[PDB]
């Protein structure tokens, strides 16, 4: 087995920066080195083969070089869509072996969230459960505080958040916070609020609804 070692394993840069990823083989693989790009939840896509040849369709900012043991992938001016994990792979000899992968993330300017709140559906309350959903849309950086207040009482350990991966067009995030309680617990309170702290905001943004109000 030929070991493949990439460096770095993770990396951050600004749009337009020169990015350089390194692949090293445990022994000579001539020029049988390929580079794949894998955006999240998607399948790997071939970028470079034979160490240095661009797959047709891949923009010219991508380029590859090296032979023997030492190989480099270069993005000459990083773009928002270049957000992905990048793998190297040797096909000089079986078994085929990959590098550990290098996650490339984009560094961009602060951007404020657009906050929304959704009361639970009617159909869901019939099943005896209430899911209250708060949405922070298109912001940077990832770090945010989302505070649930229920009749002006702060909540603890009854909500969960999920964050999207960096957007391929503007490099922002989006976040959902979901507060879940039984219909019974739900129907014992009136004010359902979502307080958001984020450094793209002058001060905290609160979105709320009153249970029952049309």
């Amino acid at each position: 087995d030929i070991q493949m070692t990439q460096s770095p394993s993770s990396l951050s840069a600004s749009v337009g920066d020169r990015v350089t990823i390194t692949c090293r083989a445990s022994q000579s693989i001539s020029s049988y080195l390929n580079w794949y790009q894998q955006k999240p939840g998607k399948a790997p896509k071939l970028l470079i083969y034979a160490a240095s040849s661009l797959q047709s369709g891949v923009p010219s900012r991508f380029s590859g070089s090296g032979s023997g043991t030492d190989f480099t992938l270069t993005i000459s001016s990083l773009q928002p869509e270049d957000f992905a994990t990048y793998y190297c792979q040797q096909s000089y000899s079986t078994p085929l072996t990959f590098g550990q992968g290098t996650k490339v993330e984009i560094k961009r300017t602060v951007a404020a969230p657009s906050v929304f709140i959704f009361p639970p559906s009617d159909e869901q309350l019939k099943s005896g459960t209430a899911s209250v959903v708060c949405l922070l849309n298109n912001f940077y950086p990832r770090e945010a505080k989302v505070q649930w207040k229920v009749d002006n009482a702060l909540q603890s350990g009854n909500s969960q958040e999920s964050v999207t991966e960096q957007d391929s067009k503007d490099s922002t995030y989006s976040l959902s916070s979901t507060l879940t309680l039984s219909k019974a617990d739900y129907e014992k309170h009136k004010v359902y609020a979502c307080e958001v702290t984020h450094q793209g905001l002058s001060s905290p943004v609160t979105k709320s609804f009153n249970r029952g109000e049309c």
Binding site: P44, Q89, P95, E165
Partner: protein, 213 residues
């Protein structure tokens, strides 16, 4: 120039899974097939490959004895069978096409997620996230197992402004996920919004319609 893989499913430990790769339009002509897995959050691991027409298979010693790779020329389909399924086998399995000059894998299937679990499948419930100069609406896809679910908006029509979140695991043991989209307020009373949810392991399909509160 496509490869299409079988749907994702759940399998009890100690059992077997056979995953299929349909080479589109009979393009087994001059293409090897490789199998590569990615355990969640991990990197890419090569399982093995087959030269379809000769039917000669090559396996990684890590998997020898547990995995069998086969091809069927009259169907244009590659097959990967993994037996004695353990929890460590929960992964997305990919087929790719291997080209024999440079050794590249120049096209990859979408991937099949195999989840090893004693628990049986459970399809999601889809709830609307009702909207109230831009406005947001969405769909709550709740209480399903295992992964994944796919969401699209209006059979593929709406894609701009669409955010589908990664599934979160709830204390109940089941996954939950929301998909949301931002649209102008004006298009509310006029335009129709239907989210399309597909949960392949339970063969559940749901098209819930989102309307103002």
């Amino acid at each position: 120039v496509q490869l299409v893989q079988s749907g994702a499913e759940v399998k009890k430990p100690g059992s077997s899974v056979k995953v299929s790769c349909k080479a589109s339009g009979g393009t087994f002509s001059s293409y090897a097939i490789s199998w590569v897995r990615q355990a969640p959050g991990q990197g890419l691991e090569w399982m093995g490959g087959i030269i379809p027409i000769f039917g000669t298979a090559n396996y990684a010693q890590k998997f020898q004895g547990r995995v069998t790779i086969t091809a069927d020329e009259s169907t244009s389909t590659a097959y990967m069978e993994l037996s004695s399924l353990r929890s460590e086998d929960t992964a997305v399995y990919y087929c790719a096409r291997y080209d024999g000059i440079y050794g590249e894998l120049d096209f990859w299937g979408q991937g099949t997620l195999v989840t090893v679990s004693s628990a049986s499948t459970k399809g999601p419930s889809v709830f609307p996230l009702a909207p109230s100069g831009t406005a947001a609406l969405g769909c709550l896809v709740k209480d399903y197992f295992p992964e994944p679910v796919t969401v699209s908006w209006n059979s593929g029509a709406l894609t701009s402004g669409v955010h589908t979140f990664p599934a979160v695991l709830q204390s109940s043991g089941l996954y939950s996920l929301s998909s949301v989209v931002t649209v102008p307020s004006s298009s509310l009373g006029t335009q129709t919004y239907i989210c399309n949810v597909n949960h392949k392991p339970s063969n559940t399909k749901v098209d819930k319609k989102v309307e103002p509160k």
